[PDB]
Design a binder for these strands. Structure first.
Ligand SMILES: NC[C@@H]1O[C@H](O[C@H]2[C@@H](O)[C@H](O[C@@H]3[C@@H](O)[C@H](N)C[C@H](N)[C@H]3O[C@H]3O[C@H](CO)[C@@H](O)[C@H](O)[C@H]3N)O[C@@H]2CO)[C@H](N)[C@@H](O)[C@@H]1O
Ligand SMILES: [Mg+2]
Ligand SMILES: [Mg+2]
Ligand SMILES: [Mg+2]
Ligand SMILES: [Mg+2]
Ligand SMILES: [Mg+2]
Ligand SMILES: [Mg+2]
Ligand SMILES: [Mg+2]
Ligand SMILES: [Mg+2]
Ligand SMILES: [Mg+2]
Ligand SMILES: [Mg+2]
Ligand SMILES: [Mg+2]
Ligand SMILES: [Mg+2]
Ligand SMILES: [Mg+2]
Ligand SMILES: [Mg+2]
Ligand SMILES: [Mg+2]
Ligand SMILES: [Mg+2]
Ligand SMILES: [Mg+2]
Ligand SMILES: [Mg+2]
Ligand SMILES: [Mg+2]
Ligand SMILES: [Mg+2]
Ligand SMILES: [Mg+2]
Ligand SMILES: [Mg+2]
Ligand SMILES: [Mg+2]
Ligand SMILES: [Mg+2]
Ligand SMILES: [Mg+2]
Ligand SMILES: [Mg+2]
Ligand SMILES: [Mg+2]
Ligand SMILES: [Mg+2]
Ligand SMILES: [Mg+2]
Ligand SMILES: [Mg+2]
Ligand SMILES: [Mg+2]
Ligand SMILES: [Mg+2]
Ligand SMILES: [Mg+2]
Ligand SMILES: [Mg+2]
Ligand SMILES: [Mg+2]
Ligand SMILES: [Mg+2]
Ligand SMILES: [Mg+2]
Ligand SMILES: [Mg+2]
Ligand SMILES: [Mg+2]
Ligand SMILES: [Mg+2]
Ligand SMILES: [Mg+2]
Ligand SMILES: [Mg+2]
Ligand SMILES: [Mg+2]
Ligand SMILES: [Mg+2]
Ligand SMILES: [Mg+2]
Ligand SMILES: [Mg+2]
Ligand SMILES: [Mg+2]
Ligand SMILES: [Mg+2]
Ligand SMILES: [Mg+2]
Ligand SMILES: [Mg+2]
Ligand SMILES: [Mg+2]
Ligand SMILES: [Mg+2]
Ligand SMILES: [Mg+2]
Ligand SMILES: [Mg+2]
Ligand SMILES: [Mg+2]
Ligand SMILES: [Mg+2]
Ligand SMILES: [Mg+2]
Ligand SMILES: [Mg+2]
Ligand SMILES: [Mg+2]
Ligand SMILES: [Mg+2]
Ligand SMILES: [Mg+2]
Ligand SMILES: [Mg+2]
Ligand SMILES: [Mg+2]
Ligand SMILES: [Mg+2]
Ligand SMILES: [Mg+2]
Ligand SMILES: [Mg+2]
Ligand SMILES: [Mg+2]
Ligand SMILES: [Mg+2]
Ligand SMILES: [Mg+2]
Ligand SMILES: [Mg+2]
Ligand SMILES: [Mg+2]
Ligand SMILES: [Mg+2]
Ligand SMILES: [Mg+2]
Ligand SMILES: [Mg+2]
Ligand SMILES: [Mg+2]
Ligand SMILES: [Mg+2]
Ligand SMILES: [Mg+2]
Ligand SMILES: [Mg+2]
Ligand SMILES: [Mg+2]
Ligand SMILES: [Mg+2]
Ligand SMILES: [Mg+2]
Ligand SMILES: [Mg+2]
Ligand SMILES: [Mg+2]
Ligand SMILES: [Mg+2]
Ligand SMILES: [Mg+2]
Ligand SMILES: [Mg+2]
Ligand SMILES: [Mg+2]
Ligand SMILES: [Mg+2]
Ligand SMILES: [Mg+2]
Ligand SMILES: [Mg+2]
Ligand SMILES: [Mg+2]
Ligand SMILES: [Mg+2]
Ligand SMILES: [Mg+2]
Ligand SMILES: [Mg+2]
Ligand SMILES: [Mg+2]
Ligand SMILES: [Mg+2]
Ligand SMILES: [Mg+2]
Ligand SMILES: [Mg+2]
Ligand SMILES: [Mg+2]
Ligand SMILES: [Mg+2]
Ligand SMILES: [Mg+2]
Ligand SMILES: [Mg+2]
Ligand SMILES: [Mg+2]
Ligand SMILES: [Mg+2]
Ligand SMILES: [Mg+2]
Ligand SMILES: [Mg+2]
Ligand SMILES: [Mg+2]
Ligand SMILES: [Mg+2]
Ligand SMILES: [Mg+2]
Ligand SMILES: [Mg+2]
Ligand SMILES: [Mg+2]
Ligand SMILES: [Mg+2]
Ligand SMILES: [Mg+2]
Ligand SMILES: [Mg+2]
Ligand SMILES: [Mg+2]
Ligand SMILES: [Mg+2]
Ligand SMILES: [Mg+2]
Ligand SMILES: [Mg+2]
Ligand SMILES: [Mg+2]
Ligand SMILES: [Mg+2]
Ligand SMILES: [Mg+2]
Ligand SMILES: [Mg+2]
Ligand SMILES: [Mg+2]
Ligand SMILES: [Mg+2]
Ligand SMILES: [Mg+2]
Ligand SMILES: [Mg+2]
Ligand SMILES: [Mg+2]
Ligand SMILES: [Mg+2]
Ligand SMILES: [Mg+2]
Ligand SMILES: [Mg+2]
Ligand SMILES: [Mg+2]
Ligand SMILES: [Mg+2]
Ligand SMILES: [Mg+2]
Lengths: 272, 49
RNA sequence: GUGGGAGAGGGUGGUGGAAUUCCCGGAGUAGCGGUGAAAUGCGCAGAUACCGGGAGGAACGCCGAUGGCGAAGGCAGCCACCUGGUCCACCCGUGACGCUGAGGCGCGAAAGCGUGGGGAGCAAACCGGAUUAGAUACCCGGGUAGUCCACGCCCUAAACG
RNA sequence: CCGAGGGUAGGGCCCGUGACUGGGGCGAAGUCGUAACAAGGUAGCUGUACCGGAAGGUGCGGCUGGA
RNA sequence: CGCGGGGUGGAGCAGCCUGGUAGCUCGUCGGGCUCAUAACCCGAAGGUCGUCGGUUCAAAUCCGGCCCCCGCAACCA
RNA sequence: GUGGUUCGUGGAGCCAUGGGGGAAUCUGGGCGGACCACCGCCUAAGGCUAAGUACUCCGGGUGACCGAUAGCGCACCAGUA
RNA sequence: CGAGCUAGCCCUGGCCAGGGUGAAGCUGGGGUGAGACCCAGUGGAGGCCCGAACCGGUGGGGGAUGCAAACCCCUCGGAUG
RNA sequence: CGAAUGCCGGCAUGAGUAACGAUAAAGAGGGUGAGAAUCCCUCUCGCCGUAAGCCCAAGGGUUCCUACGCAAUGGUCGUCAGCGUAGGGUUAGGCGGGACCUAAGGUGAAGCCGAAAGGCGUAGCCGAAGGGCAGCCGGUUAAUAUUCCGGCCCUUCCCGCAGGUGCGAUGGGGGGACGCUCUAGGCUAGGGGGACCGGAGCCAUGGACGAGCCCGGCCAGAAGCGCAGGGUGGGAGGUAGGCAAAUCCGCCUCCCAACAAGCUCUGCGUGGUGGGGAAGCCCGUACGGGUGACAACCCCCCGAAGCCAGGGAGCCAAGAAAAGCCUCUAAGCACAACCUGCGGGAACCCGUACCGCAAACCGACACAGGUGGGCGGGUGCAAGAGCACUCAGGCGCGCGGGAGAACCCUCGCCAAGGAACUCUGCAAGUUGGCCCCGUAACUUCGGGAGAAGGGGUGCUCCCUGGGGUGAUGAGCCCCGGGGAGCCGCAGUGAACAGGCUCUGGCGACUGUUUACCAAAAACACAGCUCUCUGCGAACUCGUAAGAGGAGGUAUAGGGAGCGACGCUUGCCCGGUGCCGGAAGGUCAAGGGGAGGGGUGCAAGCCCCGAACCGAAGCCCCGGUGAACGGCGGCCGUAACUAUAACGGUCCUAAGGUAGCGAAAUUCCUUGUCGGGUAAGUUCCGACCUGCACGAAAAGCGUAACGACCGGAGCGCUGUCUCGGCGAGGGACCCGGUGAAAUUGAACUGGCCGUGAAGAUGCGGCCUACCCGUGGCAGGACGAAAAGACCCCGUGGAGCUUUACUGCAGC
RNA sequence: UCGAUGUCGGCUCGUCGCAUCCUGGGGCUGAAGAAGGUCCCAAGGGUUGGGCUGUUCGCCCAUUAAAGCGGCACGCGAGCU
């Protein structure tokens, strides 16, 4: 839906906030299962190695369930859907009859009170997790494992999915959010449905501060700098570059393919 | 204005203390040099309890 | 009211085959495309034509009519749901409850616009190749917006009987 | 107190005038090309969209006021 | 003032660097087609190569000096 | 592929070795400056071994060494203020 | 050897007088087939406004062997981010 | 040694000169003393009072208190001191920190890596103004006090008795546990008033013996109460999860509650008792002591930002951890152990003085600078921590006395004119708070807005409407209305408090920046687009291990550019880049050996060595511009001239579209028209001949916004005509202390000449007794910095690239 | 003169030259008069305010007896901007 504001201030006239109506009466989270201390820090042991990180709201990590094959066969009741500061998506709090409480990343269409479960069994319904094999060709799916028993790694961003395209002996072909065509092992779990919160892309930050709230420090142009700092630094009053556009570290930034050629992963990929 | 000396006992101790110098080869040599020199004070005297 | 009937009338969800284009495998060569005639273009780096597989979008051949439906615009593969209009028969109920309609309000082809998706074919602009005195056209080889979908605008027409 | 009028400030409508600009009408025999009327030598017209010295051309849907 | 590029039939341009031969498109002129003009077709004409010198057997062509033309430069103060 | 030696790729041996290949036990093996023949010299891939040699924190001796701006930074409670 | 100054980030704390303006959303009324929407009243949003603390450092003057190796005076920017 | 802007030391000059450190301010009497403006005391005066007053923390480290001192330290003096000598002073189970806990980060057994040194590292450990944890009020010292003492009250341990129970962990669960804005109810701190209570006293100078003036009317406090408020459901089954096990927790399912009824838990009142208790007067202090006193200790009102507290509501950016504590069981042990009550005993270590917005901290100084947290009274002005005055409390800033010139600083006023000043209204004025009328273009519908422009503002009396606290009233406190009237030049009478408008450029906007000459139109910014990246991601850092990215996964991450929003962003892929091409050419080691060479009597041993087989790269074939970039010349033509829709021709990869244009771009240039003016190189509008705009190094616009920059007008003025006067701090004179750069020596005039070309010093002439004080700046090519421009040196550094040569990386 | 001779303009303050702008005296005039022209003498005094531009200079506006030209380190920054 997206919340919109009137221009009672500049920067309030474009600003735009998510709709939280799917956030069920459960705004503060769940101890026990999560949260952990989350360790803010824009850099490695010592030095900054990703520029322009820092500031922005304190967070608690929700330790979510990315391998659903523990509770094969054990169903769970979806108890709530809550805000997760550390991902684009929303998260489902679910209660297993087992007693155990996990969070699943919350797919589009998930309703509270719903039944959900994981395993070879598993009715093909939104929320359920299955090894890729038993899932019908053509159904859209998410939180897909890359290699079996290694955890969900594909399609967890808000409003993303992959679609099952066909099969090939032990592998089923996937079409990933990027549009790539991937052979992913049959035995990999993946949960049916799309991610949801799909209006995430429609949000307009609206002002500088908002950027900072999310811990995004000001990014400065190479043009703004000096020859010591950047290939684009200097010279006089503005300058068009004077070389093929580059990163600060000298590599070209328009076109230069960067995936290494001899990756053994290659023989499992069929697209862009 | 604000000058450059902003005394802090803890800082002076953690920074220039006998135990800091002892911790690394760089520092151990400092004690060696100061000893051979005949320095009355190997490290700065940080006070208080 | 009761009981019936035809229909591409509307909206949503799902689905089927033919064809084109691109990709992959096989087989296969010296030309294919195209036109008034050509050239541009594509092709021994293996094109065209032929067989197998896969992908994707869009439009539904025959039935089809000089036919049907709607208030117009408009509506056509098939299926299910939701839904409007309407004709007949019986003459059962109400009982003049009617007709029209400034304004208002809704709907309103195509092109266009916003946001996002999609993109096979086609195709403004644009680039080439021929034609001409010239060609910013007509023909030909490419080609992007758009053409498709969702939501929001736009309100025009030879919106014509 | 009110009160003609005078004064200060800010608006509304109207008329005049203005470098320069936009298209319009009119003015016997200047230029360019041929769009329309015959199937007008590309059927025409059309709402719209883009392009072009110019008439105009092309895309899309429409009309018969053409076959 | 300095620099380097250029003046060739009526128009716009080739011809030079490796000196002997001035070519193209248009235009002009004569002839056709047409009722006529243009288009088109068949013929033909037209250039002291900016000027002064010499270099060579021979100069548009190579080397000097003036003459207009274009282009660049003129910075530190 | 490099280092060592006077040797800087040189006709470049010798001595060490990171990489690849990879033997033999005296009729076995290395060397005498590419290499080959001859004539010779040595016996690699385990280890230890006084003395003669270096220095001067410390003690002593001596000076065609200084004599308080000299001589050690310091003759003096100086690596101090 | 230095981040006890300065720059950024990390962890844990603190501070921001008093005034203005009045968004959404609620509630009532209106409107409609249901809506949209429109009036109020309520509400109390914002890199919103005036202005101390606080953070600055705009213009002018002074100062110039200074009170000060960047200061003083009047003036001025921000002040729930 | 005579020179090195030489080195060390010593002493001159400037010179009794500049200064003596905030313009908050002093005067007198009396002490003391060898000696007093400067020390003590008293009286008067002034300054601070969201401090210039109190309390913490850091830092400092004896500066504390006292006795005796004044050589030096003190910008003067000093009898004084933060200085010299000595002596004394810092008392804790409850305050802070440690025998408690975890944060970032550190360290780091396991493990991983690294020539060495060392680098990483889930467990643990360390690490704190954050979690935890038991003391309040008074009194005493010259100097400590939540530490001593008094009263009242608590905490752990250890050992007993007495009563309870399956007790029991570093293991399970629960809790601890958390944002920002706004907030309700009830309290407390604190404050105002009182005809009431308590007090020495006091009637002055015209009046007042009065419900007069003045001063004060509290603090702490266990249990039990009372009032507010915070936390919490109770059963019974079933159970497969909480990494062993649980009765606990979790998840089901039935009952009864749904209330805070009940349990607890805090706060606040009250409380046995304990303590404090003014002005004034009298004393001797360097200060405290006594009396007031058997002190009184009561009633209203305002009331927090603090307390109940984990309260409530809203919002998106979604808000530590661990222990203590509750609970559940495990091994064990159930004569143990643990819980409750009561007794007795035990209770360590380090800090404690003083300064603490400053003369004791950071700035070489008793330095107009910098320094975190809490209290911070009253009155008035709408409010407030603002401003004026002033409680408590603390100060008059460690040179003074005169004078009353120039000039400077800071300040006040000014006839007439009013921007004529000037690069510029620079500066200075005008305006200024609050209530009420009233407000335009334009606009993204919010705004523009405090638009503009106006009016009101004191005091007195009369009438009158709402609340709040009390009971539905009096009072006490907040907000209103109406009507008469009074005084002055003037009523936010003092202080604090916008000058306004029109029109351009740039940048959308709040932000950011060259600490110490630039705050901007530069950076940033939401947003747009291109490109890389399928996850052990790309990229970054690191030799490595490893880490960031990210406990993220294409709606995500990195890189580049543009830079809100509107309308848009043309043509060129020839060169360079990047992308795509199992063909071809070239292409290194390696393979391969036709063939040849050297030695051997030979078997042999050792050399070179052509075919051919050999990657990436380059070549070559394509693509791609929100990739690097680029986007023409010359002639002719219309029935007045003029101009050229129209044509010719050359060349290119293509030959700049729209929009804009004498511009933050225009040389010629003050282009030419128009506008503002008496007059306009600037400004605004146009034209286009664009030296040398033009589309994401974006193009053209845009409301709002700005300590930006330009042009104009109103208002107002000492900016100016053109100055004048007054004020205070200096300047001047006197007493006290007393610097500096500079300096070859000096017995240091003018002119015209001359000289290395600008002479006090040389020539000629002219002038001129010796020495100071206040002033002025023409000169000593005055001082200051071994010119920062310029060149030179086969000097140096930062930067760049299709310079050379390497290296990392790929 | 580079071990420094501050560099345009303005402002303040002057002073000097004369090849004189005005005022005084004068000759020739194609000088009727008035007013001019032009040459000689003469520096004693005077030689305005504004718009524009950093400007010097210039161009304007309104005046005037006139709206002079040059030098003094393009006079003058230990005098200012
Ligand atoms: N009245 C005509 C209107 O204007 C236009 O027409 C104008 C022009 O097109 C037209 O120009 C014509 C030209 O077309 C034609 N080929 C040649 C002719 N000499 C011109 O003529 C013009 O100029 C001449 C001389 O000055 C006059 O005498 C004459 O009146 C005038 N029409 O002159 C017209 C004005 O007079 C539109 N084409 C027409 O549709 C419109 O309705
Ligand atoms: Mg936890
Ligand atoms: Mg590192
Ligand atoms: Mg470290
Ligand atoms: Mg940026
Ligand atoms: Mg820069
Ligand atoms: Mg660089
Ligand atoms: Mg430039
Ligand atoms: Mg550059
Ligand atoms: Mg009937
Ligand atoms: Mg009708
Ligand atoms: Mg329509
Ligand atoms: Mg359409
Ligand atoms: Mg968008
Ligand atoms: Mg096509
Ligand atoms: Mg076509
Ligand atoms: Mg033709
Ligand atoms: Mg019809
Ligand atoms: Mg008009
Ligand atoms: Mg007109
Ligand atoms: Mg036609
Ligand atoms: Mg025609
Ligand atoms: Mg036609
Ligand atoms: Mg059309
Ligand atoms: Mg066309
Ligand atoms: Mg220079
Ligand atoms: Mg060597
Ligand atoms: Mg050998
Ligand atoms: Mg040998
Ligand atoms: Mg030997
Ligand atoms: Mg030995
Ligand atoms: Mg001697
Ligand atoms: Mg000595
Ligand atoms: Mg001696
Ligand atoms: Mg010495
Ligand atoms: Mg409202
Ligand atoms: Mg507000
Ligand atoms: Mg604000
Ligand atoms: Mg403010
Ligand atoms: Mg000498
Ligand atoms: Mg000396
Ligand atoms: Mg003197
Ligand atoms: Mg003096
Ligand atoms: Mg003096
Ligand atoms: Mg003083
Ligand atoms: Mg006062
Ligand atoms: Mg002492
Ligand atoms: Mg003392
Ligand atoms: Mg004494
Ligand atoms: Mg003294
Ligand atoms: Mg002093
Ligand atoms: Mg004495
Ligand atoms: Mg003392
Ligand atoms: Mg102990
Ligand atoms: Mg500890
Ligand atoms: Mg610990
Ligand atoms: Mg370590
Ligand atoms: Mg660790
Ligand atoms: Mg602690
Ligand atoms: Mg404690
Ligand atoms: Mg004390
Ligand atoms: Mg138990
Ligand atoms: Mg436990
Ligand atoms: Mg626990
Ligand atoms: Mg009396
Ligand atoms: Mg009490
Ligand atoms: Mg268990
Ligand atoms: Mg007393
Ligand atoms: Mg709460
Ligand atoms: Mg622990
Ligand atoms: Mg103490
Ligand atoms: Mg104390
Ligand atoms: Mg303080
Ligand atoms: Mg002092
Ligand atoms: Mg001070
Ligand atoms: Mg401060
Ligand atoms: Mg207060
Ligand atoms: Mg006020
Ligand atoms: Mg104040
Ligand atoms: Mg005046
Ligand atoms: Mg006056
Ligand atoms: Mg006036
Ligand atoms: Mg002026
Ligand atoms: Mg002037
Ligand atoms: Mg101005
Ligand atoms: Mg001003
Ligand atoms: Mg302006
Ligand atoms: Mg502006
Ligand atoms: Mg800005
Ligand atoms: Mg700053
Ligand atoms: Mg600066
Ligand atoms: Mg600024
Ligand atoms: Mg500044
Ligand atoms: Mg990692
Ligand atoms: Mg991570
Ligand atoms: Mg990106
Ligand atoms: Mg920009
Ligand atoms: Mg930019
Ligand atoms: Mg472009
Ligand atoms: Mg190109
Ligand atoms: Mg190409
Ligand atoms: Mg290319
Ligand atoms: Mg390639
Ligand atoms: Mg190759
Ligand atoms: Mg122009
Ligand atoms: Mg230009
Ligand atoms: Mg004019
Ligand atoms: Mg003009
Ligand atoms: Mg530009
Ligand atoms: Mg561009
Ligand atoms: Mg821009
Ligand atoms: Mg700003
Ligand atoms: Mg004055
Ligand atoms: Mg005075
Ligand atoms: Mg004196
Ligand atoms: Mg000297
Ligand atoms: Mg001379
Ligand atoms: Mg002499
Ligand atoms: Mg002389
Ligand atoms: Mg002088
Ligand atoms: Mg020099
Ligand atoms: Mg050289
Ligand atoms: Mg010089
Ligand atoms: Mg000198
Ligand atoms: Mg000098
Ligand atoms: Mg004369
Ligand atoms: Mg005369
Ligand atoms: Mg003016
Ligand atoms: Mg003069
Ligand atoms: Mg000159
Ligand atoms: Mg000049
Ligand atoms: Mg000068
Ligand atoms: Mg100066
Ligand atoms: Mg001077």
């Amino acid at each position: 839906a997206v919340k919109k504001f009137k221009p009672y201030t500049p920067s309030r006239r474009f600003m735009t906030v998510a709709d939280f109506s799917e956030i069920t009466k459960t705004e503060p989270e769940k101890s026990l299962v999560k949260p952990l201390k989350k360790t803010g820090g824009r850099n490695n042991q010592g030095r900054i190695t990703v520029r322009f990180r820092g500031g922005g709201h304190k967070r608690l990590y929700r330790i979510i369930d990315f391998k659903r094959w523990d509770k094969v066969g054990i169903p769970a009741k979806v108890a709530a859907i809550e805000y997760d500061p550390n991902r684009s998506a929303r998260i489902a709090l679910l209660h297993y009859v087992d007693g155990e409480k996990r969070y699943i990343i919350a797919p589009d269409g998930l309703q509270v009170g719903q039944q959900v479960v994981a395993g070879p069994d598993a009715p093909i319904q939104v929320g359920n997790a299955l090894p890729l094999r038993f899932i019908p060709v053509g159904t859209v799916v998410h939180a897909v494992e890359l290699e079996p028993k290694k955890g969900a790694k594909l399609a967890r961003a808000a409003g993303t999915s992959a679609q099952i395209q066909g099969r090939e002996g032990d592998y089923v072909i996937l079409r990933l959010p990027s549009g790539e065509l991937r052979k992913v092992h049959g035995e990999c779990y993946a949960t049916v449905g799309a991610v949801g919160n799909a209006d995430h892309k429609n949000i307009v930050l609206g002002k500088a501060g908002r950027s900072r709230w999310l811990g995004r420090r000001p990014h400065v142009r190479g043009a703004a700098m000096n020859p010591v700092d950047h290939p684009h630094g200097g010279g006089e009053g503005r300058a068009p570059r004077g070389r093929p556009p580059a990163s600060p570290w000298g590599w070209q930034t328009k076109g230069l393919k960067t995936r290494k050629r001899r990756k053994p992963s290659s023989r499992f990929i069929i697209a862009r | 204005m604000k000058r450059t000396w902003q005394p802090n006992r803890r800082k002076r101790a953690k920074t220039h203390g006998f135990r800091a110098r002892m911790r690394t080869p760089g520092g151990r040599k400092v004690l060696k040099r100061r000893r051979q020199k005949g320095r009355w004070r190997l490290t700065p005297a940080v006070r208080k309890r």
